[PDB]
Design a protein around this ligand. Structure first.
Ligand SMILES: Cc1ccc(C(=O)NCCCCC[n+]2ccccc2/C=N/O)cc1[N+](=O)[O-]
Ligand SMILES: Cc1ccc(C(=O)NCCCCC[n+]2ccccc2/C=N/O)cc1[N+](=O)[O-]
Ligand SMILES: *[C@@H]1O[C@H](CO)[C@@H](O)[C@H](O)[C@H]1NC(C)=O
Ligand SMILES: *[C@@H]1O[C@H](CO)[C@@H](O)[C@H](O)[C@H]1NC(C)=O
Lengths: 536, 533
C-alpha cells in the first residue's frame, strides 16, 4: 500500500481487504464486495455444510461482485426487463459463498446498526449482486451498514437425504448462518454494531429469516427481523424429511445415479448443469408456487415444523416487521396457468379458473378445490372473465403469502412478540409488467433500497419522497424495533399488530393509513377450515 | 233480510254477515263447510266433499280451529298469543271463509286464497292478522281462507297404507281450492283468476301445489312469503314419516291397519301430548309431522321437482323478512330470551349451531361457525347473537327461497322477489329480534288501516302500497301498477341479474343478489360436504 485510499483498507478475521469508493446521489459510500466467508463448497464438499474460509495472504481485492451460486436461469421472456432484472448478473459457479458490505464514507465514528439482506428466488435462484439490492443508498442516506450474502440454492443448497452425513439438508441456510457469524466477528471493523443486527429479506429470503427466528443457534446472531412477502410457515417454504428424500432419490435417478453414501457420491460426479437441468422435474404435481429443493424439517436446524414452532415458541424478546404487496399472486400465473400472459389481458373462463385452482392449490382434493372455487367465485357474476382473472390471482396470493403472513403475525403477537404489519400498495411508474398484474411481489424492494433516489432511473419525484419514507421506516425499525420516527409525532403513527385489533398500515404515496384485519374472513378459510377439510 | 248476504253454492244456501271496514261495508261468509268432518274413522284420511244441506246455513261466524298444539312459552304475551287459536279446538274443522266487497262485485273479481302457516303443526284461518275485510273493501278483492288439518291429524303418515297415506292436510287445501273453482263465481269471484298466497308453512304449501299436477288446474298465480317446499323442514321422506308415526303410536300405546285403528281410538290431546317427542335430534325449526314425499301428491322430492319442472305460464311472488331466524332462538337455543339482550358467548354460539343445523356433522358445523364468525370481532356477544339468528334464518328460509327463485326463473317462470324490512311500531318482541318472521302479514292484510290498532300514519300509507303490490300481482301477475308512471319499477328476479326489492317505508329500492355468497355456501357447498361427511 501507500498510494491507495487509506479509507478503503480494512482487516477481517481472514485477512486484509481492499474496498471501493462508490458514488451515491448524495455522496460517496464504501463498498466491500465479494468477501469470501466460506471454503468454496465444491467437489467433495457439494451438499455439505459450509466450513469457515481459511485466512488468505496479502490484500484481497473486494471491489467487484463475486460469482453467483449455480442456478436455473429464467428464459420465459427473453430480453424483457421484468424478468431479466432478477437473472444472475455474474458468472454461475459452485464457488459462490461471498458476501458484500456497504458503509458510510468515511466509515462511521460510533458503532452503527447493521442491516443484513437475504435475497429470495424460491430457494432455487437469486444473487446478492442484483441491482435492486444495491446497498449504497441505505448506507449513504441513512448511514446504515448493509450486508448481503450469497447462499447456495437449488439442489446445491437444499437437496437432502435426511439422516445422512453427506447430504444433511438445509446447507443453504447454514451458509446464511455462517455469514451471520461472520458479521458478529467482523462487522465492527467496518464500524458496524454487532449488538444491533436486523435481518430482512423478501419471499424465500423472508422465509429464510423466519427459519433463523425458529432455529436456536441462529438466535444469538441477530436482534430484529423483517419479513417481506414470505414466511417459514405455509405450503411452499418447507418439506418433510420423507418428501425431501423422495425428491433427492428421484433427481439422482434422472441423472443416472441409482446406501445414501454411494448415491450422494455419484451425484457429486455430476456436472452442476446436469443437476439444474432436472431440478424442476421432481415435483409431485403440476403446480405453481412450488419449488423442488427447499428447507427440510430435519429435526436439527428445524426441530419441528414451522407451524408447530410458531404455535408454541416463546417470542417475548422479538421485534418483527412483516408485510405483503397488494397483488402477491399475479406474477406466478403467467408461469404455469393456461390463459395467462403478460402480453394480453388474461381474461379467463370459468373452466380455466377451475383448472387454475387445481394447479395453484396442488395438494387439494376435489372437495377442497371446490371449497376454494366457491369461496372465490363472485356469485353475482360467476362468469365475468375479469373477476375470474383477479380471483385466480387472489387464490394463489392468499394461499401462499398473505394468509401464511396473517397467521405468522397472529401467532407471534399472541406469544409476546412486538409485530408491525403493512401492505404495500404502490405500483412503480417504471414497471414493465402489464397493468392487470397490479403490484406484483418483489416490486417494493427497489423502494426500500432507495433506488428512486438515483436520478438516472426515471422514477417520479413523488416516488423519490416515498422511497425515503420507506428507508426511514426500515432503518428506524433496525435501530429501535419501532418504524415510527421519534422526533416526529405530527405524522400518523404505525401501531403494532395485535391479535385483538389486528392493525396494519397501507404503504403508498399517501400518508400512513391504519387498517384492521389482514384478509381476516378469507384467511380464516385457508388457516382454519381448509386444514380440517383436507383431514377427510 | 239482506240479499247481499244470501248466496247459493252447490251445497245449498248461505247467510253471511255485513262487516264494518274503515272505508265501507264488506260481505263476510265465515265457517263454510267444504268437507265432511274428518272425525272418527275419517281421521288421517283424505277429505271427502261436504254433503248438501237443507235450509239456510248460517255463515256469520268463524268455525272451530283444527286440533293442534297450543303454545304456552309466554302465557298472556301478545307476540305469542296472537298466533294461538282464537276459537275452540276440534277435529271437526274443515271450514273456509270468504270476504267480498259490499255490494257483491258486478264483474268477476280476481280471487286471493290465503293458506296460513304454523309449522304444519298449528294455525287457523280465523286469526285477526288474517282478516280479509281490508283487501276486500280497499282493493275490491275476493278473499278466501281455509282451515286445514295440522300436526298428526293432517300429516301423520304410514306411506303405502290405505288409512294413513299422508299429506291429507294438503288434500284439505286442494279440496278448498276445488270448492273455489266450483263456487266462487256465486260470490262475484273470477275462478279463472286465482292467486294463492301463504306464509311460512303456508308458503311451503303453496309451493307443493305448484309441484303437484292435480293442484295446477286450480290456480293461476302464487305468492310465497318466507317459506318454500324445498329446504330442510318442509318435507320428510317416506321412511322417516313411517318412523315417526310408529314412534308416536308406541308412545301412546299402539301391521298398518291395526296400528292406525288403535290410533283412531285415541283422544285428540293424547296425540298432541307426544307429537313433539318423535324428532330424531334436539333441534329448532324442525317439525314432527309435515308433508311426505309419497310419490303421489309429491311424485319426488321438491328439489328434484323444481330442478326438472317446466314453469312457463307461471308467475310467482316470493320473499323473506329481514330477520327470519330471530324468532326461534328463544324456543330452543340456550342463552336466548325475549326478556333480555341475549348476548351469547362463543361457546353458546357453537352449541346453537348444532341445534340450528341438527343434521350437520362436526365438520359441517365447523364450516358454518367459521363462515358466520366475524373474524375481526370473533368473540363479540352482539355479533355472535346476530350471527346465530342469521344461521337459522339463512339455512331454513332465505337460501331455500333463493334456490327456489333461481330454479323457477331459470325454467321459464316469471318471478318477483322482495325483502321486507320495516319493523312494526306495535311489535312486542324485543329490539334485537329485528323484523321477525310473520310480521309482514299484518301489513299485507292491511290491518294498519284500522285506526284503533294505533299504527302510525306512515305505516298506513305503507300497508296501502303492499296491498296494491299483492292485488296487482293477483290481477295481472305483475306487482307494478299499470297506471302509475313514476319510478322505480319492481323488476323480475332473474338468474343473471338476481334483482329483488326492499319493502320498507322508503320507496322501492332495487338490490342485486339475495345473500348470494352465503347461499352458495348453503346451497352448493354444504350438500357436497354432508355427503362426503
Ligand atoms: C428449477 C425451477 C425453475 C423454475 C421454477 C418456477 O416455479 N418458476 C416460476 C416462477 C418464477 C421452479 C423450479 N423448482 O422447482 O426448483
Ligand atoms: C309439537 C310442537 C311444538 C312446538 C314446535 C316448535 O318448534 N315451536 C316453535 C315455533 C313458534 C311458533 C310461532 C314444534 C312442534 N312439532 O314438532 O310439531
Ligand atoms: C393470452 O395469450 C396466451 C398465449 O399468448 C393465450 O394462451 C391466452 O389464451 C391469451 N388470453 C387471452 C384472454 O387472449
Ligand atoms: C430515462 O428517460 C430518458 C428520456 O430522455 C431516456 O433517454 C433514458 O434512456 C431513460 N432511462 C431509463 C433507465 O429509463
Amino acid at each position: 500500500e501507500g498510494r491507495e485510499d487509506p479509507q478503503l483498507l480494512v482487516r477481517v478475521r481472514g485477512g486484509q481487504l481492499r474496498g471501493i469508493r462508490l458514488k451515491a446521489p448524495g455522496g460517496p459510500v464504501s463498498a466491500f464486495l465479494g468477501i469470501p466467508f466460506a471454503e468454496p463448497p465444491v467437489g467433495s464438499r457439494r451438499f455439505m455444510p459450509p466450513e469457515p474460509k481459511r485466512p488468505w495472504s496479502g490484500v484481497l481485492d473486494a471491489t467487484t461482485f463475486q460469482n453467483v451460486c449455480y442456478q436455473y436461469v429464467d428464459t420465459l421472456y427473453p430480453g424483457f426487463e421484468g424478468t431479466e432484472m432478477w437473472n444472475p448478473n455474474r458468472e454461475l459457479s459452485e464457488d459462490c459463498l461471498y458476501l458484500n458490505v456497504w458503509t458510510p464514507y468515511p466509515r462511521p465514528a460510533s458503532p452503527t446498526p447493521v442491516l443484513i439482506w437475504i435475497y429470495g428466488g424460491g430457494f432455487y435462484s437469486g444473487a446478492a449482486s442484483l441491482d435492486v439490492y444495491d446497498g449504497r443508498f441505505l448506507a449513504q442516506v441513512e448511514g446504515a451498514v448493509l450486508v448481503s450474502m450469497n447462499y447456495r440454492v437449488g439442489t446445491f443448497g437444499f437437496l437432502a437425504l435426511p439422516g445422512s452425513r453427506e447430504a444433511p439438508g438445509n446447507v443453504g441456510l447454514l451458509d446464511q448462518r455462517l455469514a451471520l457469524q461472520w458479521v458478529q466477528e467482523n462487522i465492527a471493523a467496518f464500524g458496524g454494531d454487532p449488538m444491533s443486527v436486523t435481518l430482512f429479506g423478501e419471499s424465500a429470503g423472508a422465509a429464510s429469516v423466519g427459519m433463523h427466528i425458529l432455529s436456536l443457534p441462529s438466535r444469538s446472531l441477530f436482534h430484529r427481523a423483517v419479513l417481506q412477502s414470505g414466511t417459514p410457515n405455509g405450503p411452499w417454504a418447507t418439506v418433510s424429511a420423507g418428501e425431501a428424500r423422495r425428491r433427492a432419490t428421484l433427481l439422482a435417478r434422472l441423472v443416472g445415479c441409482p446406501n445414501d453414501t454411494e448415491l450422494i457420491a455419484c451425484l457429486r460426479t455430476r456436472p452442476a448443469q446436469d443437476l439444474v437441468d432436472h431440478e424442476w422435474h421432481v415435483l409431485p404435481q403440476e403446480s405453481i408456487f412450488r419449488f423442488s429443493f427447499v428447507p427440510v424439517v430435519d429435526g436439527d436446524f428445524l426441530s419441528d415444523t414451522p407451524e408447530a414452532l410458531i404455535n408454541t415458541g416463546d417470542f417475548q424478546d422479538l421485534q418483527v416487521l412483516v408485510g405483503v404487496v397488494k397483488d402477491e399472486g399475479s406474477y406466478f400465473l403467467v408461469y404455469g396457468v393456461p390463459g395467462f400472459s403478460k402480453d394480453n389481458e388474461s381474461l379467463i373462463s370459468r373452466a380455466q379458473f377451475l383448472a387454475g385452482v387445481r394447479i395453484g392449490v396442488p395438494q387439494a382434493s376435489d372437495l377442497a378445490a371446490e371449497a376454494v372455487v366457491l369461496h372465490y367465485t363472485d356469485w353475482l357474476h360467476p362468469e365475468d372473465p375479469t373477476h375470474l382473472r383477479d380471483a385466480m390471482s387472489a387464490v394463489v396470493g392468499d394461499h401462499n403469502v398473505v394468509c401464511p403472513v396473517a397467521q405468522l403475525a397472529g401467532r407471534l403477537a399472541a406469544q409476546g412478540a412486538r409485530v408491525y404489519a403493512y401492505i404495500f400498495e404502490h405500483r412503480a411508474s417504471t414497471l414493465t409488467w402489464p397493468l392487470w398484474m397490479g403490484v406484483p411481489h418483489g416490486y417494493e424492494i427497489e423502494f426500500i433500497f432507495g433506488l428512486p433516489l438515483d436520478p438516472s432511473l426515471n422514477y417520479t419525484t413523488e416516488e423519490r419522497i416515498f422511497a425515503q419514507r420507506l428507508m426511514k421506516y426500515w432503518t428506524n425499525f433496525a435501530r429501535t424495533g419501532d418504524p415510527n420516527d421519534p422526533r416526529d409525532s405530527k405524522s400518523p403513527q404505525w401501531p403494532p399488530y395485535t391479535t385483538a385489533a389486528q392493525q396494519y398500515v397501507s404503504l403508498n404515496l399517501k400518508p400512513l393509513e391504519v387498517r384492521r384485519g389482514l384478509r381476516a374472513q378469507t384467511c380464516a378459510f385457508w388457516n382454519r377450515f381448509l386444514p380440517k377439510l383436507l383431514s377427510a
